[PDB]
Design a protein around this ligand. Structure first.
Ligand SMILES: Nc1nc2ccccc2[nH]1
Ligand SMILES: [Mg+2]
Ligand SMILES: [Mg+2]
Ligand SMILES: [Mg+2]
Ligand SMILES: [Mg+2]
Ligand SMILES: [Mg+2]
Lengths: 239, 834, 334, 49
RNA sequence: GGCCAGGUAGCUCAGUCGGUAUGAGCGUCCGCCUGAAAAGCGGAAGGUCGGCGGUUCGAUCCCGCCCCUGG
């Protein structure tokens, strides 16, 4: 006979995925940082080597805070947390940040304007692309199983050089873009008081909504953010 | 935009000049472009077609009248002695035009087989095809008309149209503007495949035309940022001439429409070399040509016929009578080339990338020239591109190149356009990659991409070429070496992370709260940070309510929702309405997220130089200019709180369920809360509690106001709770309990109080008076019969007394109970029940 | 790599039981003096095959714990005998279950590493020792208050503890009636994950209660966490934007037919249109035959691509009625 | 008014302390092992010198 | 940005170029029925037809501006 007189509850799958991702990096010694969603233009663009009046900053659409030219915006990524961490913390730095990010995309089955991102930043002596690749492979193994294979290919981001994109191989089985990465640009280290001849670093950023989409095969991303209980309840209570 | 469209045949041709016989499959080319950093958005093969698809010439046209559309019966010469009768609904051709005919038995792209149909009372032996039906281009309004001389009737259609080709749709990153051309992409492939490269802009491919004098009087204001401005004329062009099919086809496959030889040549050389070019009608230029900033309120009519409001930072080309062009964005209608233009002045200019980017964005004109200039164009090929244009136009339009040339190259004239040299250690790419590359890898790769490399022991001096203004720092050179060697050779090595501290106390608290609410029957949702339209008006808030002092967004996706959330409740209530309106009427939602509460009008901070660390004063100044962003937990409840079952019909949501949510969050935060009656919209003023942790208020809970529920389309009895987690202090208690082995004493006390007296106040007074002997107190009865006075209530508490070192007598416990009764009498006016 | 899947599960089980009103204890591994004789266990009971101690602290308690219940029932007696009569305790600890007489392994030379065959020989000579979760309840399950007089503990509270553990383990359990001391044979459920038995739950036998001095109506749970496989499902829900159809069906079955069996048969027949099903009525009386019962389930139908007509839902309901007739002999209430 | 119909529950402090110790060491990269309480003398004394 | 085309009940939609949307399917309510339900039969309620103005004696419908979608 039914004995559960309590209604069925559930934590959101995106919150559960962020918690699993945070646990994955804390198990490797990393820590979890914070950051405000309304960020100054200095920390979202200027400190991240974004050139002024350049398509690197222009072609990227941004939610700007009124009035016009207020140097205030809704952060386009969790990358400003790299600036706040390198300014406040002592070296070496091994941090991840999970928060909401804001883009001007129309909400459909594969795009969402308001999503959650996982930013990673490691700054230390002698960090190379091999360490970035080692971190990316461990991240992908924790979220996609031991048989997960990744590939990095060159790309561009103003705050990294060299920059790259990360694909994952867990159609039925092919290369799907996961996130962006690269070595921290020496201008970013100089904008935070760090000697690029002494310290190197890498960074990466993955969307949580995108990660859950192909980790579970979820069709409509609109169900991820609209808040219908029919989407959360099948995932269980979650810890 | 950053799209680059080009057909493989053209790209293969430019590569093959230096690497004869070079040919790769489209799949391998896509992988190689990806492995070096070129996003391949689409790979579009042309056609395919099968069967009799041939070139024809329209030799007669009969107009079939009396239908829903003009219908033509056409006699088409297909190269044999029997002309074919074909019915066509298009009107974009005339007698003598060359067309593409699909005869019966042919198969067009999409599996469509062609056959002879009895249509419009006439015999149709095939069809005249449009570019869309052949999968050659997007045009479907009319049929495809080849320019005269493209082919003879009877030529194979697939060969003439080049349907064996494949169009690559590339997305070029803003740091590789040199790749917005066949020149750049072919050079990249030469690097990737270790090929010898022949630059299509070199003097061996574009031999310099004579320079016997100035081409036109020119004044340049160097403050406009212009780096080069060249002019060369072509006189006596034939207005009846049309571009050959090979030229119009390559433009079409690159996403550009053909118009006239003068414009076609400028667009073609733009795609081939990456240098935008423009053709002015020289006979419509009046006086000296001037390059200057626009003046306040100045306007200009671009060659599309639209008047453009200009700005003092826009760069213009002007003559004595009118504006000739918006520098690097679009030419004006005054000097545009028309159908009767016979003398042309070609313009090859290099504009300031920032000035063009600002102007084209403000004017909403992302032209093919604009997006190339804002990504920098190689200033060393300006005259080469100019000479390439003049010779091609003279050849195609039957004109003559004039041996005159104006070439402004700055004041004083600049002769070398190479960026400053860069010093870098020979093994620096190896250290950043974590890979031991073979000796000479760095020098070879940097010379491959066009830089000059000199060796000074272990230090390389690298001068990047003029078309690579992105190579400014050693990290830039590192990326060139790594991407050309391939990122796949970089091994996977775990970094030396130090011992961490784990999750902060606040991070663990959010997990415990979310876990406890979910286990208590709540469903978590992600709250949108944008407030719904006029929600505070629905709540009936005062105009000076602190929740209304929000932060607005200039360009929201919904113009009615620009403000940011000062409270999590509107997003939760919207999610509640979605659920209930779809059949899920018994729902309890919660959300843990931040809000945005500014304390002043939006104040921006100026630009701090990014070449140094900002001072601690500047860091604290940037933080104070941002609104406060505290962490909030909130929940909403409607419908049944206890589901129905064999036990009974269930229990509807009531305010006490919201108060219980407060207690769940409190127990999850290891703190004690006190609840006090309060008035705070949008809650019900008689069913609303203010939550306190110590003396600090942390939020509210209870049932929502009925007028708010009606105005908001909410279910009746909807309850809500919101707490500020940042206002709750983090606590880590260390209890040291000592279990008493002696028996307890059980006593109950019935106290009559006024109805307004809170039960917790009576309980706290009983605790205060009973002393240390009181081990437990629990309310188990609230009685309001007329035996109790009006507006009064009887409360019965179960008391449990226990001593730590002795067995109590009944008098011992009654002494503590009587002191508790006296304390309730003094603090809440309690009377012992008679 | 952090915590293993199992270690994470023991945390979630402990958190969920405490939030549900259970107090954790540390169970002692030493069995009370002839506790199984108090339970009335058979001489051949697998729990009686224990590992004994040469030098115990008390000469009458030298046996190791095969089950966590004797330690929890002991801690329950301490609480009740000291004035705390409404208790619910749980414990997550391993037990000891030898499969033979205590066998010894000869001395292996320390100057070298023992081969993997010598390691396996040392493991087989040890009891199995799996991780268990158990709980005991007595007195008031729901405390009294202004809402009412509270509810005494009943067997269904032990079954709800099973469902609390099962939800924390992210697995589905099925309960079947069973006889297994020290439980009441008419108030005992054997718990199954798939086809594997994982433990029992329900009310304790009244004779066992009286002979142990336990409170009347004491209930108990014990599950083998090692027999419950680890699961990490990856759901892919798709929320249908189309309206649902609500229907109820009343089915009459023999009294011995479990309500979950009827629910499973209705679900198997209703097909993919069935979005939710809940039992809200159990009715007996002379209107229904003797030793029979009527069950009414609330059904929610929804299509993923269309709005349903009432005939669409009734068709799925009739198929569910037919499936219940074939599986549990259900008869549509007339 | 009282709103908690669920009786008071609690996890044991020793389990809570073990959880806090375990979390402290996981955050440093360590892991958590397993061990039987009924142990052979080969593993409890002989192999430990 | 372009002229179109969509915005209509709680959900998914149909339909109207001036005085009723005789709106559909499902959702809500009532009666018969049942111990209590559901189905079934018989009935009801509920839209200010995206918002703000204008035209008109009257606007879902015609006009202007605006918000939200697809081409
Ligand atoms: N959000 C994000 N973060 C990044 C960090 C490095 C490279 C690319 C990135 N995109
Ligand atoms: Mg670069
Ligand atoms: Mg609608
Ligand atoms: Mg009815
Ligand atoms: Mg009806
Ligand atoms: Mg009606």
């Amino acid at each position: 006979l039914p004995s559960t007189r309590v209604p069925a509850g559930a934590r959101h799958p995106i919150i559960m995925l962020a918690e699993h991702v945070a646990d994955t990096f804390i198990a490797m010694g990393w820590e979890l940082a914070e950051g405000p969603e309304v960020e100054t233009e200095q920390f979202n663009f200027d400190a991240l080597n974004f050139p002024a009046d350049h398509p690197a900053r222009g072609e990227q659409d941004t939610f700007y805070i009124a009035p016009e030219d207020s140097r205030q915006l809704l952060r386009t990524h969790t990358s400003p947390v790299q600036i706040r961490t390198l300014l406040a913390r002592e070296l070496p730095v091994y941090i991840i940040s999970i928060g909401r990010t804001f883009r001007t995309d129309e909400l459909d089955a594969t795009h969402t304007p308001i999503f959650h991102q996982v930013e990673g930043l490691a700054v230390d002596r002698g960090l190379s692309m091999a360490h970035l690749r080692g971190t990316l492979d461990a991240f992908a193994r924790a979220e996609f199983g031991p048989s997960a294979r990744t590939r990095i290919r060159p790309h561009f981001f103003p705050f990294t050089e060299p920059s790259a994109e990360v694909d994952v191989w867990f159609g039925g089985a092919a290369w799907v873009e996961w996130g962006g990465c690269g070595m921290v640009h020496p201008n970013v280290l100089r904008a935070t008081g760090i000697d690029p001849d002494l310290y190197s670093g890498f960074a990466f950023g993955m969307g949580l909504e995108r990660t859950l989409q192909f980790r579970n095969g979820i069709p409509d991303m609109r169900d991820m953010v609209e808040g219908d209980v029919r989407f959360s309840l099948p995932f269980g209570v979650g810890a | 935009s950053n799209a680059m469209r080009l057909p493989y045949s053209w790209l293969r041709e430019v590569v093959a000049v230096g690497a004869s016989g070079w040919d790769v499959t489209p799949g391998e080319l896509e992988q190689t472009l990806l492995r070096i950093g070129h996003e391949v958005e689409e790979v579009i093969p042309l056609g395919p077609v099968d069967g009799p698809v041939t070139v024809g010439r329209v030799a007669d046209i009969e107009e079939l009248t009396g239908y829903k559309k003009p219908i033509r019966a056409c006699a088409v010469d297909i190269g044999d002695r029997q002309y074919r009768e074909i019915i066509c609904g298009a009107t974009n051709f005339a007698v003598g035009d060359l067309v593409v005919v699909a005869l019966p038995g042919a198969t067009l792209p999409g599996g469509f087989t062609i056959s002879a149909r009895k249509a419009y009372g006439r015999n149709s032996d095939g069809m005249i095809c449009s570019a869309a039906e052949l999968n050659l281009g997007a045009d479907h309004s009319g049929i495809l008309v080849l320019p005269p001389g493209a082919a003879e009737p009877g030529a194979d259609g697939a060969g003439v149209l080049g349907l064996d080709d494949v169009v690559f749709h590339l997305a070029i990153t803003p740091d590789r503007g040199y790749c917005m051309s066949v020149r750049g992409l072919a050079r990249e492939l030469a690097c990737a495949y270790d090929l010898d490269f022949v630059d299509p802009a070199s003097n061996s491919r574009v031999p310099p035309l004579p320079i016997e004098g100035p081409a036109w009087p020119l004044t340049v204001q160097p403050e406009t940022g212009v780096r080069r401005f060249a002019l060369r004329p072509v006189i006596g062009i034939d207005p009846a001439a049309v571009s050959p099919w090979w030229l119009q086809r390559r433009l079409l496959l690159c996403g550009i429409r053909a118009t006239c030889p003068a414009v076609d040549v400028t667009n073609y050389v733009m795609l081939e070399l990456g240098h935008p070019m423009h053709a002015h009608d020289r006979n419509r230029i009046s006086g000296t040509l001037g390059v200057r900033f626009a003046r306040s309120g100045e306007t200009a009519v671009t060659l599309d016929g639209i008047e453009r409001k200009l700005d003092t930072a826009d760069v213009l080309i002007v003559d004595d009578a009118a504006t000739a062009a918006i520098g690097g964005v679009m030419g004006a209608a005054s000097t545009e080339v028309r159908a009767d233009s016979t003398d042309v002045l070609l313009e090859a200019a290099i504009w300031d990338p920032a000035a063009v980017s600002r102007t084209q964005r403000r004017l909403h004109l992302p032209s093919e020239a604009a997006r190339r200039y804002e990504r920098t164009v190689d200033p060393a090929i300006s005259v080469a591109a100019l000479d390439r244009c003049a010779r091609l136009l003279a050849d195609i339009a039957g004109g003559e190149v004039s041996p005159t040339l104006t070439d402004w190259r700055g004041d004083p004239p600049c002769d070398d356009w190479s960026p400053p040299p860069i010093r870098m250690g020979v093994d620096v790419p190896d250290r950043i990659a974590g890979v031991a590359y073979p000796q000479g890898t760095t020098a070879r790769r940097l010379a491959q991409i066009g830089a000059v490399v000199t060796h000074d022991g272990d230090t390389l001096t690298v001068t990047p070429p003029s078309w690579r203004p992105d190579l400014r720092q050693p990290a830039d050179l590192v990326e060139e070496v790594l991407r050309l060697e391939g990122l796949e050779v970089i091994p996977s090595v775990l970094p030396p992370a130090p011992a961490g501290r784990g999750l902060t106390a606040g991070q663990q608290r959010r997990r415990t709260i979310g876990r406890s609410l979910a286990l208590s029957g709540y469903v978590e949702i992600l709250p949108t940070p944008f407030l719904p339209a006029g929600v505070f008006d629905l709540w009936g808030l005062e105009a000076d309510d602190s929740r209304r002092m929000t932060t607005r967004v200039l360009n929201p996706l919904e113009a009615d929702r620009p403000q940011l959330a000062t409270t999590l409740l509107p997003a939760l209530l919207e999610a509640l309405v979605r659920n209930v309106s779809r059949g899920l009427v018994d729902v309890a939602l919660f959300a843990i997220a931040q809000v945005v509460q500014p304390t002043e009008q939006t104040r921006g901070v100026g630009l701090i130089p990014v070449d140094r660390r900002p001072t601690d004063d500047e860091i604290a100044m940037l933080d104070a200019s941002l609104p406060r962003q505290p962490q909030h937990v909130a929940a909403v409840l409607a419908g049944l709180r206890e589901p129905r079952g064999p036990w009974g019909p269930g229990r509807p949501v009531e305010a006490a369920d919201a108060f219980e949510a407060v207690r769940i969050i409190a127990r999850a935060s290891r703190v004690d809360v006190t609840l006090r009656p309060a008035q705070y919209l949008p809650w019900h003023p008689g069913r609303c509690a203010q939550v306190f942790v110590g003396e600090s208020s942390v939020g509210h809970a209870g049932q929502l106001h009925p007028a708010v529920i009606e105005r908001s389309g909410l279910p009746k009895g909807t309850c809500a709770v919101e707490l500020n987690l940042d206002a709750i202090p983090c606590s880590a208690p260390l209890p040291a309990p000592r279990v008493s082995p002696y028996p307890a004493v059980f006593q109950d006390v019935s106290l009559v109080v006024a109805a307004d007296i809170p039960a917790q106040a009576v309980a706290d007074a009983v605790r205060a008076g009973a002393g240390d002997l009181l081990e437990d107190i629990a309310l188990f009865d609230v009685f309001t019969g007329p035996q109790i006075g009006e507006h009064r209530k009887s409360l019965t508490f179960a008391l449990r007394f226990r001593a730590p070192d002795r067995t109590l007598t009944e008098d011992d416990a009654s002494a503590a109970r009587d002191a508790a009764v006296q304390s309730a009498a003094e603090r809440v006016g309690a009377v012992l029940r008679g």
